[PDB]
Amino acid sequence: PPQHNFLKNWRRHIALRKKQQEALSKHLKKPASELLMHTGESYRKIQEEREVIDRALPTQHDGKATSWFWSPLEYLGDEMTGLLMTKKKTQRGLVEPITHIRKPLSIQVETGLPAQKDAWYRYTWDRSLFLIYRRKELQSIMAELDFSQQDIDGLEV
Amino acid sequence: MRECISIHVGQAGVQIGNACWELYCLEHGIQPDGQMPSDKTIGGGDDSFNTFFSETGAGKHVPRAVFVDLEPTVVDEVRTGTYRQLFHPEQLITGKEDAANNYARGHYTIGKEIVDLVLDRIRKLADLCTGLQGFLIFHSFGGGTGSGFASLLMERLSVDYGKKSKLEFAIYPAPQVSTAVVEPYNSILTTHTTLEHSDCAFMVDNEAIYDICRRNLDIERPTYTNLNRLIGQIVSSITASLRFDGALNVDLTEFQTNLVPYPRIHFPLATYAPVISAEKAYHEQLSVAEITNACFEPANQMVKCDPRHGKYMACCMLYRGDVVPKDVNAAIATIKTKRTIQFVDWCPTGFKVGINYQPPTVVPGGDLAKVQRAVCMLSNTTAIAEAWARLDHKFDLMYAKRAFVHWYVGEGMEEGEFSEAREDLAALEKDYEEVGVDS
Amino acid sequence: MFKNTFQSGFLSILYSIGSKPLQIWDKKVRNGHIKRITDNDIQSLVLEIEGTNVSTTYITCPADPKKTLGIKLPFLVMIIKNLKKYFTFEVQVLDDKNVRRRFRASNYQSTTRVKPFICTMPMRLDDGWNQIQFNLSDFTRRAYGTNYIETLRVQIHANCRIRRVYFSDRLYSEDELPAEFKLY
Amino acid sequence: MREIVHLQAGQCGNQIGAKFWEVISDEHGIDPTGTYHGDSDLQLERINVYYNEATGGKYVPRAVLVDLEPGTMDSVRSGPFGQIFRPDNFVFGQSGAGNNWAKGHYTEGAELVDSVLDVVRKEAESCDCLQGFQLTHSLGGGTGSGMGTLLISKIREEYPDRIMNTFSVVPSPKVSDTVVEPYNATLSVHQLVENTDETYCIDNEALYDICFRTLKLTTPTYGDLNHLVSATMSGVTTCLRFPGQLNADLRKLAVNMVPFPRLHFFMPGFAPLTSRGSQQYRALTVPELTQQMFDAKNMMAACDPRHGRYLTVAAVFRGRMSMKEVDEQMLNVQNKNSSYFVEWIPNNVKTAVCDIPPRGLKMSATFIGNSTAIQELFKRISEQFTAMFRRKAFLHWYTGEGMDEMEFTEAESNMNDLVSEYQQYQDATAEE
Structure with missing residues (x-):
C-alpha cells in the first residue's frame, strides 16, 4: 500500500506504547514523567544545554577552542619506523553555527505527555547555585554565541 | 589519543592509585627512578606508554593523575616511600583539617576551601594532553574525604565537561561488617550526587574479597595490599585495549555506551577471574568455558547478591591473554542455553568480544600466579537492588530518632535533604523493580 | 511581483478553476506529472502534483528565478488534499535585517531545526482536504526574533492536490470568506 | 585503461x-x-x-x-x-x-x-x-x-x-x-x-x-x-x-x-574446502566440484537454501577442463532438482570458465548464486528490531545525537515491504 500505512504504523506503535505503559503505571500508580519513557526529551533538553555550555566554556578557557591552524602532529607506531599522524576536523577554520531542537504541543501530547514537569524535589542540579551564578556571570559569552532565544512549541498546523 | 586522567580522593583512593601505578610501572618495565637505566639487558618497555605516562625531552616519565586528601598523614606516608622520585610534590596536596568520615565539614567548611588549586591542577593536566575520553575517580563512601570533597569536585567537573566520560570507583559498606558507624549517613547523600550527576558507577565491598581470598587464595591473615592488588588487576583488565591492541579493541566509549541501558540504572556487576594463588594455578587446566561459567557464580561476585533473585538486562564481557575465539563461541553457546542463568524476555543477547594479545603479568612478592589468560565481566541485573533497600531501611531506622544528626545541624545544612535523598532512593528502587518486572 | 500592487484582504497566487492557474508558476517535473483534473470529493477542477521523489517534482513562484513575489500579507492559506504520501513546501521570506530566510514544512519531520538561513518544520495532514494556515510573521519572530517584511518565493512539492493558494492580512473564518474562497 | x-x-x-x-x-x-x-x-x-x-x-x-x-x-x-x-x-x-x-x-x-x-x-x-x-x-x-x-x-x-x-x-x-x-x-x-x-x-x-x-x-x-x-x-x-x-x-x-533492483543480495562460496590430510587424496573432476557448489554444507550461509527456490545462479570456474561437463551437469541438476529453482524461468545457471589457473592451486571454482534463503535472516532481523523498538531501549544515545525516531519507523516500514515482497515472490507460481 501507499505511504499511509507507514504513518499509521508509527502512530499505532506510539498508541500501543501508551496503552501498555499506562497499564503498567496504573498497575503501580505513578505519573508518566516519573517513569522510564518520558525522560528522553528532558535528556535532549540537557543536550541543548550542553551545546550552549560547550560552546561557552571553551570560549572561557584554553586549548579546546584555540586557533588550530598551526598545531603540529606526532610520529608513532614503534619508535620511528612508520608515519606521522594527522588532524582532520574543524582545524581548517570551519565556522560551525549553532543548532537547537524542541517539540510541538499536540505532537508531544500524542507522544505521551503534554510537557509535564518532573518531580519538584529531585533537581538540585538544575537549581544548583553554581549553574545559576554562571548564568549570571557568562551573559557576555552567551550573548556572543547566540542571540536567538527560542520559543517553539506553538507551531502545529 | 586514548589518554585519561585519574582522580584519587581519600586514603583508600590514594592507596588504590599507588597500587595501580606500581602495577603499571612493573608491567611496562618502568623503573622507579623515572628513566630507562637498563642499558645492559633490556626487558621490555617499547610500547605505547603515552596513554598513561608522558615522555619528556630527557627520557623521563611523568605520572598523570590527582592525589588529593584532606589529611596530610596519607600524603606523608606516600612521600617517605621508595617511589617519591617518580611523581611530583605539586600533585600531592596536603591539608590542615580533614573530614574523617564526615560529609558536613568536608562538603561545606573544609572542601570549599581548596577548590581553585585542584581546578587549576586538573586544567593544567588536561591542557598537557591532546585526547581525553574519561576519568578514573577513586574515592570511598565510608570515608568523609571521599564523600564530601568528591561530591563537590564531581559536580563542578560535570558542568565543566559534558562531552567526557565520568566513571566512579569506591567501596560499599557491607551489611555484615563495617569500619565506622556514620557510613550510611555519608552514603545516602553521596548516592544522590553519583546518580543525578554522573554516568556510571562501580559498586564493590570488602567482605566479598575476604570470602574469595579465604576460599581460593587460602590466607588466614589477610591485608589491604591484596585487596589493592585485586582492584588494580580489575582496573588494568578493564582498560586493557587502551594501552595495547588486539583483534577487537574495546575502548572506554565502546563499552560505556552499551553499559548504560538507562541513565538511572548504571550500576554494573564486575567480576574478575581467575582470582587464584600460586598453588591454585599449577595442576589446574584453565580454559574459557569453565572460567566464564565460574564468572556467573555468586561465590565469585564482589557484591553479596544472589543472581538468581533477579535477571540480567545487559552484560559486558572482556578477555585478556591467549584466548581463541572458538572457545568464546562455545562458551556463549553454553551459557545462552543455561536455564539457571536468568534474563529478561526482551534482551535475547548482548555482549562484546575483547581479545587482548598481551597476557597479564605477575608481581614478585604477590599472590597471583602466572595465568595464560584472564577474563572480566560487567553485567547489569536487578538482583543487586537489595543493597539499596537494606541501606534505605538502615537510614530510616537511624533517622526516626535522629541519631548523630545534631552535628550536621550545627555544621550548617538544611534538614530536608535527608527526606529528599530518602525519596530519591525510594524512586530509584521503584524504577529498578519496574524494570525487573517483565510483561 | 506584487510589491507595487495594493495588498489587502486576499491575494490569490493560485486558483485551480482559473483558466491559467500556473501563469506565474514554474513547473519542475521528474518521474511524475503535474495535471489539472477533477477531484471526486468536491467535483471540481484541481491541480494534482505527483512524483516518486518529492524533491524532484514541485512548482515555484514566481516563474522567473530572478524575480521575487514581494507580498507583505502575513498569512499564507492553501487548500490542499492529502494524498497520503510525503509532502512538503518551502517559503522564502525577507526580514528587517535584510536576510533571506526559508521555511520548509514537511509531513516527515519531527522537530523544527532552526538554522541561520533555513527553518525545517513538521506538520500534519488529515485525510481528504486540509486548510493550512501559515503565520509567516509569527513563525519568523519565533524562529529568528525578526519581523516579517515580504514573501520572496513559494514552492510546493508533489504528492498533493492543490485547490487554492492565497495570502491574507488576517485569519478569516469560513463565514467571512467569500463564496469563491469557500470549499463546498 | x-x-x-x-x-x-x-x-x-x-x-x-x-x-x-x-x-x-x-x-x-x-x-x-x-x-x-x-x-x-x-x-x-x-x-x-x-x-x-x-x-x-x-x-x-x-x-x-x-x-x-x-x-x-x-x-x-x-x-x-x-x-x-x-x-x-x-x-x-x-x-x-x-x-x-x-x-x-x-x-x-x-x-x-x-x-x-x-x-x-x-x-x-x-x-x-x-x-x-x-x-x-x-x-x-x-x-x-x-x-x-x-x-x-x-x-x-x-x-x-x-x-x-x-x-x-x-x-x-x-x-x-x-x-x-x-x-x-x-x-x-x-x-x-x-x-x-x-x-x-x-x-x-x-x-x-x-x-x-x-x-x-x-x-x-x-x-x-x-x-x-x-x-x-x-x-x-x-x-x-x-x-x-x-x-x-x-x-x-x-x-x-538481479531480477529486480530491490533484491540485489547474493550468496558467495568457494568449492575446494578440504582438510589438511585430505589434500593428498582427492579426485580433480567436474561432478565433485558440482556437488560442492550445489550443496548447502559447503555454502557459507547461516541458513538453509533448501527452504526456498533458486532464483539466479552463476558458476564461475578457474581452470582448464572443458565446457560440455558444466552444461550437462547444470542440465541434469535442473532436471532432477526441479523443486529447488523457479520453474517459470529456465536455465538459471550461468557458465563462466577462467582458463588461467590460480597460483598455488590447480583447480578452483567459486559459486555466486542468489537463492531463497536470506528471507529467514530478514524476518528474524525484523522481529528483533521490533522487540527492541517495542520498549525504546538503548534509544537515548541515538536520540541524544540529534536524529529523530521516525527514521526507525520508515526503516522498519521498508523492511516489512521488502520481506512481504520476498515472500510473495518466493512462491512464483506459473498462473492462477
Missing part, C-alpha cells in the same frame, strides 16, 4: 582488505618491498587494474582506508606488507565511533568526509576511465557501516555510471558483538537497498562452522576467515584480472543476476 578503485571501511574491513592485498601480491608475484619478482606472463599486462604505473616499475596499491580510530593503522602497517600502501589514503579521526551509526554518520562524518572525497576524486581523475568501486566493510560497528553508506551515496551521486559492489558482513543472533547491532543493521539495510547496486552476504559463524567441520583446524582465527574471503574475492575478480576463453565482468553479473 579499465581499472578498479578499491575502498576500505571498518577495522574488520581494513584487515580483510589487507589480507586480500597480500594474497593478490603473493599470487601476482609482488615482493613486500614494492618491486616485481613474478615469473608469469599475464601478471604484467592487466596488472594495472589494482596497481599504478610508477618509476622503476614499483607498482603502488589503489585503496583508500577510511576509519575513525587511530589504533587500526598501527596494526595494519606493522605487518609484512604494511609499508607498501599509500600512507596518504589512511584517513583517520581522533574520536572513535563507539559502535554508533547515528553519531558516526553525523559527528565523525562531516569534518572527516571531505578528505576522503578529495582523495577518491583525485584517484578517479588519475585514471582515464573506470568501471566501478569496491568497498569491503562490516555492519558490526559505526566505522564501516556508519561511513560506507555515506561514501557509496556520495560516489553514486557524483558518478552514477559506476559499479557499486560491496561485501558487508551480515550479523547473526547466535554470534553477536554489539548490543545495538539490530539498530545498525536496520539503518544500513535501507541505504543498501536504496543507493547500492549489489551487495553480498558475509557471515562469520557459517565460516567458523565450515572450517570446524570440514577443514578441521586446530585453532581457527580471523586470519583464516580473511584468507577465505580474500580467495573468494580473487575468484570473483579473476574474470577481469585474468582473461581466458569465456570472460565476464562485474556489471554483466549485476545485470544478469
